Symmetry: C2
Subunit: 196 residues, 2 copies
């Protein structure tokens, strides 16, 4: 039989094509994101550079680029790649190749994750733009520091960062256990700011 859901280590499961927010838990997300690699694993270092670590850098960069950000926006930045815990990581060039299809699932997973945590199902276009810019800045530094791209390649593909420098975050690839711990800790810190 074709598989319709992803079982989680915690016992929960999420329907792949019509995910329910009520099946989403941050422990499940953090576990997976701390083991899923960016850049197809083509990165310098004994440990893969994980999606969880990418999320941490993105949220950090987002806050530096957007000093007026609200806690809800910070959480949307941290959780932007959360759907990868069920759909996996695919490099951007293939996102333009996949069917519609895959993109529909990705959008549904975003809504499920957001709704779970009392966030708008989708970021506004303006907020999406801010988070995407932070993502692309992170990509520039990962591409050059970790994934073997020249500065010329990274500038072409990602653009030259505007006012963000590599000393504003930590890019050395973390082991899964540490990435997981740090991801949950930041999520919990932002949750605390949100009620406030």
């Amino acid at each position: 039989s074709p598989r319709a859901w992803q079982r989680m280590l915690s016992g929960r499961r999420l329907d792949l094509l019509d995910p329910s927010p009520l099946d989403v838990e941050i422990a499940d997300i953090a576990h997976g994101l701390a083991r899923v690699a960016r850049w197809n694993g083509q990165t310098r270092g004994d440990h893969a550079f994980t999606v969880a670590q990418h999320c941490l850098i993105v949220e950090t960069i987002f806050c530096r680029m957007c000093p007026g950000a609200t806690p809800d926006e910070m959480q949307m930045a941290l959780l932007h790649d959360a759907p990868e815990y069920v759909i996996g990581d695919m490099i951007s060039p293939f996102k333009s190749v996949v069917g519609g299809g895959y993109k529909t699932v990705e959008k549904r997973l975003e809504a499920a994750v957001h709704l779970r945590f009392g966030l708008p199902p989708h970021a506004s276009r303006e907020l999406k733009d801010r988070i995407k810019k932070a993502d692309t800045v992170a990509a520039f530094f990962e591409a050059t520091e970790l994934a073997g791209f020249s500065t010329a390649e990274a500038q072409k593909f990602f653009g030259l960062p505007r006012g963000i420098t590599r000393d504003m975050f930590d890019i050395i690839p973390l082991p899964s256990t540490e990435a997981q711990r740090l991801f949950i800790a930041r999520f919990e810190a932002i949750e605390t700011l949100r009620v406030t």
Copy 2:
């Protein structure tokens, strides 16, 4: 500008949509496969369960299921998931959602990898079937031991293995550096067998 290639740590690059066999090198494959996770990282263990480790289990299971396998066939088993070093890992359920363009890329990458190593560009229909059966048995064991699936779930999705047992291979997730070392070692061992079988 959109990106048309993947640069490797070794300096070479592979074109994503029209890969050349001559840009493929096993060191690049091993490095990446030893860091790409299966099961979307939803696995028990301090370390991700990597595609490289999956390949090693598949090739071992394949040999056990197919005692008459030739060295070329062993190598095609080990390398079946090699394209993931450029296309990444996607769970099987999303293959019916992803579209024909993706499948075409996969197949072109299989050819590039195979041609690099002097193998048929694609496995015969019959070899493909044998490798797939081995892959599915590996999936059964990974699903139950690592990825949180019950025996009933794994039986439903992958079938109950027949004559393959968990003691035949190593399922606990290995760190990237060790999965990489073991993957290269097995690739090289099979390469030696290929030279033996082909003769002068």
